[PDB]
């Protein structure tokens, strides 16, 4: 079989909530803020605005990577498809 993942696509495209676990994301946001500068602290709405921008940005990256792999006649993504998707965007 090896292909019913196509039903996951349709489920997670029907769904529209945020997908990364809030605590892990908040821990990472704080860790990246705290080694950047002292005593920066985030309102919940700022962490949510960050996470929505991140996940929308990654959905864009995966759509772009999909078209790179489809263009390469693949049905699979490798890190090189992401590195094209960065250089072709200028990222």
């Amino acid at each position: 079989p090896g292909t019913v993942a196509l039903r996951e696509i349709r489920r997670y495209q029907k769904s529209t909530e945020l997908l990364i676990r809030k605590l892990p994301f908040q821990r990472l946001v704080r860790e990246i803020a705290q080694d950047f500068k002292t005593d920066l602290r985030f309102q919940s709405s700022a962490v949510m605005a960050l996470q929505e921008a991140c996940e929308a940005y990654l959905v864009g990256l995966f759509e772009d990577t999909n078209l790179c792999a489809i263009h390469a006649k693949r049905v699979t993504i490798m890190p090189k498809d992401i590195q094209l998707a960065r250089r072709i965007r200028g990222e």
């Binding site: 495209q13 005593d39 990654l58 993504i77 490798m78 890190p79």
Partner: protein, 81 residues
């Protein structure tokens, strides 16, 4: 500890990939994505803090990040500003 960005879990990155519409995912992709995910905050949190540092507040507001996202060309609705 799990602070190595591996706290962004394999199935969570794979679910973002599935919403993104991609089929077979090679096992290095999760870690390549965690690399991009750091760099996106090294743009967005960094510039959002330069807006927090306009007022020199302790609290980061949703406005502070929306201004950084606006100068970085990825505007966001629902939070206002």
């Amino acid at each position: 500890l799990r602070d190595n960005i591996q706290g962004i879990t394999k199935p969570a990155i794979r679910r973002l990939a599935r919403r993104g519409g991609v089929k077979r995912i090679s096992g290095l992709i999760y870690e390549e994505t965690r690399g991009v995910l750091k760099v996106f905050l090294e743009n967005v949190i960094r510039d959002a803090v330069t807006y927090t540092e306009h007022a020199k507040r302790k609290t980061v507001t949703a406005m502070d990040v929306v201004y950084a996202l606006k100068r970085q060309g990825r505007t966001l609705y629902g939070f206002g500003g």
